[PDB]
Design a protein around this ligand. Structure first.
Ligand code: 9A9
Ligand code: K
Ligand code: K
Ligand code: NA
Ligand code: ZN
Length: 639
């Protein structure tokens, strides 16, 4: 399978700039490109990437999204002097031209097609193109908003034509609306376009009615355009993650795209003079990670905007870090989205209820400036540590490894004489392994996560949890697939327990989330809704120091454990410990693969979730959203 991350870049795209006074355009500078590449270099990230060279887009490739009359017109700008270039620029809105911009636009476009080819030929897992000019505002017959040609529109059309893809997702997390992309695929259901953008009730450029949440596409494309307008500035990490958990990801996983292309503008990060939002560069590490389980990880990131030269480099680094599979930074201080964001989320969910499974219940009323620096994200020396039953030899990826100390031995003796009596030296060995892997995870920073097969749950769980809390792990998220009770106290706020089980239990405290899913062909789509809309919002708000996965011997959800294992590594710097009760080489091989950063195989189509399951999930939201506001996807009613 594929490996590596492409970084397509070329200094030549910094060799055009604005040649006259124009405050509308003067933020779009060559240094945007040189600052981001140097930031990747400083942090050792450009060196870890497969460099792929740029090429020019050909004429036939430009004509996939643009008219001959507009190409012929742009093709004449290399011969223009400055007076003629200003006059040509004024025929369009918020855009300037340069003797060399036609040359660089073909390079930005060709660079994008290079990244599609490398990803679709499996020569790399994923990648990023650092390009100028941006593309997402550019239209069939017009330059607009610093954009000459629509790089990301090309990528989607090119990938349709030359790889016969039927389902491509475009995520535009730039702070501006990519109307050029919207127009190009408005009637196209094979390309799903999601955009969030500063809108402020249409007072913010480009001041377009069709950038509102009510633009869902046209004709056969109805439902495949999703606009999320931001109507106030100052949106934070919590707003962005609310948008992902309750709008984008539910549609994205149900759509099941065969390729993901990000219009990656970082004018949506704190410090940017255009966006005026407050999301930290670290959020982009997670926006990236949250989408990587789609399309077997085949993600093409294309640079759009981002104009604060400091926020810019930091955010490019967080994105590539995640593309390379480095551990995600912990996001603290998360909570409810602001009211304007909940209103926008509310509205787009309701208008899209006609078209998408996760929102379908919302339709029938039987249901209804300075900031701190990002800390270093080092890949752990060996990512994953596996402890199969003694004697069971397995073939592991290059970043996995098998397992005891003298200190670990005395600790197990100490634990045994105090709390457990217990003589089985096999159980006593799992306890010795649990301690040692945790010590390597929590203290060394040389190991990231791990999986240990165990015999008895009640002793190994209790031992793993208690030992983790003194590592110290201020907070532990526990995810348990199984029935019955675990030696897990959720009374003091140090521990949150997610329990996927079969028998509907009593809702206890607000530190438990219990999901009893009706068995059948529904279990997979039901589980993925709960994961994106319930498990991840709480977990992200809880911000644990360690994740403890636990699976009972009692297969039925072999198909979703990989996605959860992948997505839950957004928490706790990827530090997860999975206890598997009983040997099952299929589940253990899947756990290790996802844990080690391997590409996750797609889910494909699934029977829509059962109404009883959706009803069960919304009862959990109502019960928990007052404590865990990141669960909110409506505005709260005031007293
Ligand atoms: C800059 N240009 C389009 C940006 C292209 C882009 O970044 N696309 O992704 C015009 C819109 N910007 C503003 O109206 C503005 C003025 C003052 C303060 C904050 C905002
Ligand atoms: K956008
Ligand atoms: K579309
Ligand atoms: Na102008
Ligand atoms: Zn922008």
């Amino acid at each position: 399978a594929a490996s590596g991350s492409a970084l397509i870049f070329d200094e030549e795209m910094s060799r055009y700039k604005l040649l006259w006074t124009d405050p509308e355009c003067e933020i779009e500078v060559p240094e945007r490109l040189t600052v981001s590449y140097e930031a990747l270099r400083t942090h050792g990230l450009a060196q870890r990437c497969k460099a792929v060279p740029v090429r020019q887009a050909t004429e036939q490739e430009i004509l996939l999204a643009h008219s001959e009359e507009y190409l012929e017109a742009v093709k004449q700008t290399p011969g223009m002097n400055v007076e003629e270039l200003m006059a040509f620029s004024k025929k369009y809105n918020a855009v300037y031209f340069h003797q060399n911009i036609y040359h660089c636009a073909k390079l930005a476009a060709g660079a994008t097609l290079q990244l599609v080819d490398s990803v679709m030929k499996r020569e790399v897992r994923n990648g990023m193109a650092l390009v100028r000019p941006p593309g997402h505002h550019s239209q069939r017959s017009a330059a607009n908003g610093f954009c000459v040609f629509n790089n990301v529109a090309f990528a989607a059309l090119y990938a349709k034509k030359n790889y016969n893809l039927n389902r491509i997702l475009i995520v535009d997390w730039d702070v501006h609306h990519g109307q050029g992309i919207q127009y190009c695929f408005e009637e196209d259901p094979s390309v799903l376009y999601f955009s969030w953008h500063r809108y402020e009730h249409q007072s913010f450029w480009p001041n377009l009615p069709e950038s509102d949440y009510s633009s869902v596409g046209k004709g056969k494309g109805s439902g495949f355009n999703i606009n999320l307008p931001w109507n106030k500035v100052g949106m934070t990490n919590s707003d962005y993650l609310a948008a992902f958990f309750h709008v984008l990801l539910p549609v994205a996983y149900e759509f099941d795209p065969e390729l993901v292309i990000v219009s990656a503008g970082f004018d949506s990060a704190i410090g940017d003079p255009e966006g005026e939002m407050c999301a930290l560069p670290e959020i982009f590490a997670h926006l990236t990670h949250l989408l990587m389980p789609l399309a077997a990880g085949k993600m093409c990131v294309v640079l759009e905007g981002g104009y604060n030269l400091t926020s810019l480099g930091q955010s490019v680094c967080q994105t590539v870090h995640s593309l390379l599979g480095d551990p995600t930074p912990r996001i603290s201080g998360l909570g409810t989205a602001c009211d304007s964001a909940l209103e926008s989320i509310q509205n787009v969910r309701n208008v899209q209820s006609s078209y998408w499974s996760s929102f379908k219940h919302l339709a029938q009323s039987e249901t209804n400036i300075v900031w701190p620096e990002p800390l270093k994200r080092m890949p752990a020396s060996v990512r994953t540590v596996v402890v199969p039953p003694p004697g069971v030899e397995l073939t592991l990826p290059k970043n996995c490894q098998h397992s005891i100390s003298e200190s670990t031995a005395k600790e197990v003796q100490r634990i045994r004489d105090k709390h457990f009596d217990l003589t089985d030296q096999n159980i006593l060995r799992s306890l010795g392994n649990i301690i040692s892997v945790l010590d390597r995870m929590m203290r060394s920073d040389e190991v990231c996560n791990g999986c240990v097969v165990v015999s008895d749950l009640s002793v190994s769980v209790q031992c793993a949890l208690q030992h983790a809390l003194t590592e110290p792990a201020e907070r532990v998220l526990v995810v348990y697939v199984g029935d019955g009770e675990l030696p897990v106290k959720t009374n003091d706020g140090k521990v949150f327990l997610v329990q996927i089980c079969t028998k509907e239990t009593e809702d206890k405290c607000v530190n438990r989330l219990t999901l009893c899913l009706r068995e059948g062909e529904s279990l997979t789509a039901g589980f993925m809704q709960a994961l994106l809309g319930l498990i991840l919002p709480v977990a992200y708000e809880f911000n644990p120091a360690l994740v403890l996965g636990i699976v009972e011997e009692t297969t039925r959800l072999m198909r979703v454990w990989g996605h959860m294992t992948c997505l839950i590594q957004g928490l706790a710097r990827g530090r997860m410990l999975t206890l598997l009760q009983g040997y099952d080489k299929d589940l253990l091989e899947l756990t290790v693969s996802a844990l080690s950063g391997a590409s996750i195989s797609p889910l494909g189509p699934l029977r829509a979730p059962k109404p009883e399951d959706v009803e069960m999930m919304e009862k959990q939201r109502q019960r928990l959203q007052e404590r865990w506001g990141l669960l909110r996807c409506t505005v709260s009613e005031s007293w």
